[PDB]
Amino acid sequence: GAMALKRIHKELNDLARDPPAQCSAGPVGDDMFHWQATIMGPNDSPYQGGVFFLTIHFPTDYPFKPPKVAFTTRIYHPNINSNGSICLDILRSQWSPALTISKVLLSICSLLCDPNPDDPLVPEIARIYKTDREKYNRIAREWTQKYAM
Numbered sequence: 001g002a003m004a005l006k007r008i009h010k011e012l013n014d015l016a017r018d019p020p021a022q023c024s025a026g027p028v029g030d031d032m033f034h035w036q037a038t039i040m041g042p043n044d045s046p047y048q049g050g051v052f053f054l055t056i057h058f059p060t061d062y063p064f065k066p067p068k069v070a071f072t073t074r075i076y077h078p079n080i081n082s083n084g085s086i087c088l089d090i091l092r093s094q095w096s097p098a099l100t101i102s103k104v105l106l107s108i109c110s111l112l113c114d115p116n117p118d119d120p121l122v123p124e125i126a127r128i129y130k131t132d133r134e135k136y137n138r139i140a141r142e143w144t145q146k147y148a149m
Contacts, residue, residue, distance in 0.1 A: 005032060012032075014100065034055070035056040037105060038051055042112055051073070054071050063099075066095035071084035075112075075143060078115045079115055082122075
């Protein structure tokens with residue numbers, strides 16, 4: 001409804017007024033409920049140099065239910081699968097209307113930096129993350145080269 005639209009416009013403006021400087025997000029075209037985002041691979045992570053695209057769909061009762069967020073760029077990560085689905089608490093059970101797209105993107109950035117052990121969406125990548133970090137990093141760097149450059 002009108003309340004959701006007002007809140008989405010405010011967040012769009014929040015992002016413009018205080019640009020995050022490694023992420024961006026906004027409407028695809030003229031549809032305020034469907035956004036795109038980009039996250040730069042964090043420096044000192046195996047994703048460094050990559051640019052990762054996301055899609056965001058806001059529900060009509062936003063901000064009281066979470067947006068749906070998925071990657072469109074392929075990535076080697078324990079908590080993000082080949083469909084681009086993201087296992088992240090705040091997108092499910094831990095959503096609050098105090099959260100914003102800006103905070104979601106920062107949380108996803110932090111997730112890239114430090115995966116969650118309890119949530120293996122891709123069990124084999126989770127396993128290599130836990131057992132052979134140097135191998136995980138090598139492969140995550142190779143996938144950044146292959147998909148995110």
